[PDB]
């Protein structure tokens, strides 16, 4: 199949972060996540391109998870650098159609709940953190759901993995506004909003206040409460990587969120959040034995990366007991 | 759920920087068992440690620690060690030890008792013998290490062989301690105490602070490389303690600081560093039995090619590295 | 124990910086035999890459070697190569040979007559076709795959089927010896060794040796291109025999070195300080960092970062551009 060999290429063309992971899955799984990246990355790649007007945009997303089965649909008119995925999308959809009827299901379910929730949100910012939880569901949390569902219809992981949304949407809201937290300053550049105004206003006029040196204070503190509001999600995260018992499934779901657990403490109560892009620490004594593939050394990554962070709570912070006891109710379980 | 395991938790992170991430990472009963363990011996190494308790006083004191697992308001306000509060919070930490089924108050009681005993008859005394050496190493370490493998037993996750095997569990702790008291001869010099055996450093310098001193360096690195050529004679019994380990927390937990402490002696290896501060420790990670092994045969080769000609153990630190080898 | 085994792992740790750990660590009966017979093989090469001794004398060597095994008394005094302890005291390497289990003599000394024959057909000759070049690789390295898979075998610690699948145990080899060929090009020609195809290097250049000089720079690189691309074939019998094994320290053995070839061609792929110095040997983005050779799935996922690595850097005015994307395409698949 050249049309399959194509979807391989488009996926080390455009997924820099899984597509060796992702070529790694065992049996079915690796064409159905392989295939299951690339729609959601033409998805994206529409939702994400500024020069299609709302007039245009709004149907594209709706009806997206139907584009996967007309044979011939493509779009021809997208500025985005990820274009070739949409203009040659028959080649995408026709490998779709040609997945167990299994995996279809569950792919379509999440491009079409995936294109309503982006609509609703191309219109407006985030505001509370409810909202927070909601627009990361749609965009990540959903991926995680869908992921899960595509591992336990492949009979590599127990049904529980599918079934069990909540875990899985955790997974997603981790990573999601990890990299949100992250990326402050690149979005800000860029004239896009990730952080959530209801929590943001408590300290500054406007988001883009966080830029500028005589605030950087401030920044910071909002930057520690973000940071504990995505801890939350770490015990979910903890017991849906304890559920996994496929290597090739771990190693796919685990390193991403050892990464993101880095990534948080590296941006703990760290001033260059906000003058650029943030170093990654250099890795504790006990992590630089271990490497994210069993779950006991998983645990103790994340077990090591939290106490880098509580070590680092600051009394004056207004988030300090907040931080002290969602890590001390982690570190229990 | 429980304010008090919690409590615990906290104090796990507040005095063990190196081993609770790991202790936190063990299957089920494990985890409360050692996370308990450790900060009941980690109350019995504070009083142990603490100077201004007169000997008198602390004899008892440590006799009778283990008794004091079962005094529920027990607890010794008197401490001014870093890890006080411990002591001063015990009625928390005894209030969780007696939440643990029997079967692991059995063996922590047990290890309690008989480091106490250890303990106080150390005292009075340095240690002077190699054999004496390993007694105090046996006391305050290998009980530890017989302790925790009773524990992995007893909790159904490993075979009752491991428990069972003393001597292997004796040397997995005699190794670490070794290592950690080579690695701190300079810290231990600076607040008054001595842990190198006499009858090794007496051969060299007429008072163990002598190797503190920039004109007797020679000699300092001389009876270091000698005490490291001792610690390595434990690698054998690790490496068959840690082969019979079935179950991949307790692995990970009892493999890690054996190989940490491995690199560590690798790096102090004929280092004139250890007597003028802190040693730099500098596709692989330590998860299963092989990876391990190999880690390990990398460390003793780094040490292997530093070995001086001249120095008076180049022989014996060939021999055992060869015998590790071989093996 | 043996103070004669002692000495051989002193051999062992002299000779092989890259394999002793690993060879140290295997389970039981296969740590003496491969120890033994990296050894054996050590003696044999330090005979053939001696160029002191004629070919007239070193010919009945070669072809003895195999025998010389079983004559407790034999050994070599007029080596002046760096390994010469060896063959001055092989036979304490010859007692300890003897002192294997019987079925694992029987592999070595095969082994060990067949590359004899094959190192004596080519003291006289160079490599001229890539069938050649096949050829050569086979006796110098196939063959120990061969052996080495057939002592896996033998022990019971693998499946019958790895140490039958000569093709693919003759892969791995070919797979590490074209690696360090490629490599080593420079060393090679300031030491009077040629080991490129000439039948390849002749469509670029008069002379192997102008590839050193600064001039033809981009015809040399063309030609390392060509090269590369040609190794790259036999990745997917190194996955196919790594993903068979079920020993783990048997795996570990096979997989590092492995890991450690691609991971070269990577870096010396379109890379022209192959022929400055030696290539500075690097590191992936951080997952590989976050992994490590010791399960199969990891393995597959360091083998496809390596393949991308190689993929985003193929010039398109190269003249293999469109088989190395081929080959690389095919190992996705
Ligand atoms: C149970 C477990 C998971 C790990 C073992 C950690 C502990 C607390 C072991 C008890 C052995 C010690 C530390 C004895 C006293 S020497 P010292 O270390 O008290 O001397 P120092 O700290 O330098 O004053
Ligand atoms: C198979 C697998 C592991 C994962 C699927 C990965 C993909 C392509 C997910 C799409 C998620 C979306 C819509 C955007 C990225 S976050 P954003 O909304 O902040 O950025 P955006 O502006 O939409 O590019
Ligand atoms: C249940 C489970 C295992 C996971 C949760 C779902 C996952 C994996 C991801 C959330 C979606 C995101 C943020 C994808 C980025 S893909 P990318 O690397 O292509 O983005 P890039 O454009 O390269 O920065
Ligand atoms: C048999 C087996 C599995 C292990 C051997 C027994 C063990 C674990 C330890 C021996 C006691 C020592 C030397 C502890 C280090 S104190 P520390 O390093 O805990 O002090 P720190 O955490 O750095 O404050
Ligand atoms: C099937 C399988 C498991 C393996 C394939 C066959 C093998 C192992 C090797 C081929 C020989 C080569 C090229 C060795 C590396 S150089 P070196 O050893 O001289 O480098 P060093 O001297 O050790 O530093």
């Not at 703990?268 to 779950?295: E, P, S, W």
């Not at 645990?299 to 009394?315: G, L, N, S, T, V």
Request: charged share 25%; aromatic share 10%.
């Amino acid at each position: 199949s050249s049309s399959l060999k194509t979807c391989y290429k488009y996926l080390n063309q455009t997924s820099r972060s899984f597509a060796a992971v992702i070529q790694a899955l065992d049996g079915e799984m690796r064409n159905a996540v392989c295939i299951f990246y690339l729609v959601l990355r033409a998805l994206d790649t529409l939702e994400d391109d500024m020069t299609i007007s709302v007039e245009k945009k709004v149907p594209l997303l709706h009806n997206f998870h139907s584009f996967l089965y007309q044979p011939d649909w493509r779009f021809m008119e997208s500025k985005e650098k990820d274009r070739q995925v949409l203009e040659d999308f028959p080649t995408i959809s026709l490998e779709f159609r040609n997945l167990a009827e299994k995996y279809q299901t569950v792919i379509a379910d999440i491009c079409r709940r995936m294109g309503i929730g982006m609509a609703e949100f191309l219109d407006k910012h985030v505001t509370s953190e409810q909202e927070w939880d909601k627009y990361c569901h749609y965009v990540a949390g959903l991926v995680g759901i869908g992921l899960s569902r595509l591992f336990s219809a492949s009979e590599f992981e127990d049904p529980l993995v599918g079934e069990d949304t909540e875990r899985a949407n955790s997974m997603g809201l981790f990573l999601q506004k990890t990299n949100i937290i992250r990326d402050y300053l690149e979005d800000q550049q860029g004239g896009r909003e990730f952080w959530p105004q209801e929590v943001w206003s408590r300290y500054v006029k406007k988001l883009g206040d966080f830029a500028k040196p005589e605030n950087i204070d401030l920044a910071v503190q909002c930057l520690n409460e973000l940071i504990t509001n995505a801890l939350h999600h770490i015990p979910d995260v903890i017991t849906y990587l304890s559920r996994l018992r496929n290597q090739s499934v771990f190693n796919f779901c685990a390193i991403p969120q050892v990464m993101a657990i880095a990534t948080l403490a590296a941006c703990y109560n760290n001033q260059q959040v906000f003058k650029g892009a943030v170093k990654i620490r250099k890795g504790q004594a006990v992590t630089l034995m271990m490497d994210a593939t069993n779950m006991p050394a998983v645990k103790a990554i994340i077990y090591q990366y939290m106490e880098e962070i509580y070590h680092r709570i600051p009394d004056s912070d207004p988030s300090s007991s907040k931080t002290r006891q969602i890590i001390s109710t982690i570190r229990t379980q």
